[PDB]
Every structure is written in structure tokens, then in C-alpha cells.
């Protein structure tokens, strides 16, 4: 997963979870990448799938 | 199974929009971004209960897809959860609407604008969208937006979340019904 094209003003809402370094499951890549941006690059990917 | 229930493809999970039909052929509508590249649909995570196969997909530009039921026994309720749906209608600004999705359940709000353009990036732009102040989250895609017994749209995407509030865009269901020559029941 690469969050360079982010942030994006909108995300589709399909569910394909990712597990962030904050132990939160992010519903999809768009959701995850926007949070990475919002965290000013501090959030990272822990693993694919639910946390 | 009815509008708002979970549906699983080989890729992930979305929500069933509305059960529709043409003659004696049953299908269900959902988001085009969910039907894109998906073939078979199942009713459960275990992929043991088959629903049917994708018959059409339109995304980006629009955001709707249709799946033909191949499961002959599963009940196909013309409702959204327990809510009966008896017709389809056009959204209007100020209209009170309700959405149901497989992740967040049922949430209400109002239509705030029409004919909105949503850019999901990478060339994925959808046009003619209904904008609302209703929240939605991953897994809710394709779920129904209704108003009383009237079918209004299919969940496409947006921003925010249900805890802090959000903005969700929906594809007008009338457009999908017309493209496929199907009707709600």
C-alpha cells in the first residue's frame, strides 16, 4: 500500500481491511491512506487484514 | 436477504442495494465499484451460500452494478431490513432519507445537493451524484438510500464517519433501474 496520491477528498466504501500501527482496523486503503496523511505521516501499515 | 445486508465477492464486502426484477428474473443492485472485476457473490464470509453472478457493472462515471440471482431458495425480500419498498423516486434537496449498510446499520439525514461530481482519484470520477449529510463507512457501499417506502439511491462513497458525522454521495437508483430495465417490488 502506497499513500502518495493522498489525501483524497472522498473514498468509496467497500470493505477490505488493513491493520494500522495504532491497532485500528482501517476499512479500506483509501480510508487508511487518508488517516496516514491526517497523522502527518506517523501512522504506518502493520499488516493486511483486520487487526 | 434484503437491502442493507452484507454481500461478499472474491475481493471484499459490500452491501446489497435493492432486490429488483425483470419478468421472472431476479437480481440485486449494488455499487458499480463493488461489481467491477467481481464475478460471483456470496451471502456469507465463509463463501458457502451463493447469491449469484454479476450481470452488469458501471463505474466510474456512474456507480451501479447488477447481480443475477442463481440461488434458487434464498428469500429475496423487496425490503430494506424490515422496511417495505414499493417504488422508486428522484431525490430532491431537503428530502429526509435513510441509509442502511452492512457495517453501520441504519442512519438518517437529508439530501443536501444534487448532480454532484465526486473524484475518487486515479481517473475514477463519478457524476450526477446525490449529496447528503448521512454518514457511512467501509462495507456500507451499495446499500440503499430510501425515504419511507421509496427507493432513492445506492451508497457510493464520501468522507467522515458515523461517530463524528460525515458526507455521503449516492447514485440515483432511477438511473440503474432504467439502464437494466428492472423494477423494485
Swiss-Prot record, chain A:
<feature type="disulfide bond">
    <location>
        <begin position="19"/>
        <end position="51"/>
    </location>
</feature>
<feature type="disulfide bond">
    <location>
        <begin position="11"/>
        <end position="30"/>
    </location>
</feature>
<feature type="domain" description="Kazal-like 3">
    <location>
        <begin position="1"/>
        <end position="51"/>
    </location>
</feature>
<feature type="site" description="Reactive bond 3 for chymotrypsin, elastase, proteases A and B, and subtilisin">
    <location>
        <begin position="13"/>
        <end position="14"/>
    </location>
</feature>
<protein>
    <recommendedName>
        <fullName>Ovomucoid</fullName>
    </recommendedName>
</protein>
<feature type="disulfide bond">
    <location>
        <begin position="3"/>
        <end position="33"/>
    </location>
</feature>
<feature type="glycosylation site" description="N-linked (GlcNAc...) asparagine">
    <location>
        <position position="40"/>
    </location>
</feature>
UniProtKB/Swiss-Prot annotation, chain B:
<dbReference type="GO" id="GO:0006508">
    <property type="term" value="P:proteolysis"/>
</dbReference>
<feature type="disulfide bond">
    <location>
        <begin position="135"/>
        <end position="162"/>
    </location>
</feature>
<feature type="disulfide bond">
    <location>
        <begin position="14"/>
        <end position="34"/>
    </location>
</feature>
<comment type="similarity">
    <text>Belongs to the peptidase S1 family.</text>
</comment>
<keyword id="KW-0865">Zymogen</keyword>
<dbReference type="GO" id="GO:0004252">
    <property type="term" value="F:serine-type endopeptidase activity"/>
</dbReference>
<keyword id="KW-1015">Disulfide bond</keyword>
<feature type="active site" description="Charge relay system">
    <location>
        <position position="33"/>
    </location>
</feature>
<keyword id="KW-0645">Protease</keyword>
<keyword id="KW-0378">Hydrolase</keyword>
<keyword id="KW-0732">Signal</keyword>
<protein>
    <recommendedName>
        <fullName>Streptogrisin-B</fullName>
        <ecNumber>3.4.21.81</ecNumber>
    </recommendedName>
</protein>
<feature type="active site" description="Charge relay system">
    <location>
        <position position="63"/>
    </location>
</feature>
<comment type="subunit">
    <text>Monomer.</text>
</comment>
<comment type="function">
    <text>Has a primary specificity for large aliphatic or aromatic amino acids.</text>
</comment>
<dbReference type="GO" id="GO:0005576">
    <property type="term" value="C:extracellular region"/>
</dbReference>
<keyword id="KW-0720">Serine protease</keyword>
<feature type="active site" description="Charge relay system">
    <location>
        <position position="141"/>
    </location>
</feature>
Amino acid at each position: 500500500v502506497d499513500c502518495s496520491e493522498y489525501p483524497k477528498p472522498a473514498c468509496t466504501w467497500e470493505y477490505r481491511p488493513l491493520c494500522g500501527s495504532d491497532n485500528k482496523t482501517y476499512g479500506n486503503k483509501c480510508n487508511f491512506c487518508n488517516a496516514v496523511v491526517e497523522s502527518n505521516g506517523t501512522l504506518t501499515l502493520s499488516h493486511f487484514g483486520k487487526c | 436477504i434484503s437491502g442493507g445486508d452484507a454481500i461478499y465477492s472474491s475481493t471484499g464486502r459490500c452491501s446489497l442495494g435493492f432486490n429488483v426484477r425483470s419478468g421472472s428474473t431476479y437480481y440485486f443492485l449494488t455499487a458499480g465499484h463493488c461489481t467491477d472485476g467481481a464475478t460471483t457473490w456470496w451471502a456469507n464470509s465463509a463463501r458457502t451460500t451463493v447469491l449469484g453472478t454479476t450481470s452488469g457493472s458501471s463505474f466510474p462515471n456512474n456507480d451501479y452494478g447488477i447481480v443475477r440471482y442463481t440461488n434458487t431458495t434464498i428469500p429475496k425480500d423487496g425490503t430494506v431490513g424490515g422496511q417495505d419498498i414499493t417504488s422508486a423516486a428522484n431525490a430532491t434537496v431537503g428530502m429526509a432519507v435513510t441509509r442502511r449498510g452492512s457495517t453501520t446499520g441504519t442512519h438518517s439525514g437529508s439530501v443536501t445537493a444534487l448532480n454532484a461530481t465526486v473524484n475518487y482519484g486515479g481517473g475514477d470520477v463519478v457524476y450526477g451524484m446525490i449529496r447528503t449529510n448521512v454518514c457511512a463507512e467501509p462495507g456500507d457501499s451499495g446499500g440503499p438510500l430510501y425515504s419511507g417506502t421509496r427507493a432513492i439511491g445506492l451508497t457510493s462513497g464520501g468522507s467522515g464517519n458515523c461517530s463524528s458525522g460525515g458526507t455521503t454521495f449516492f447514485q440515483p437508483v432511477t438511473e440503474a433501474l432504467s439502464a437494466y430495465g428492472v423494477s423494485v417490488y
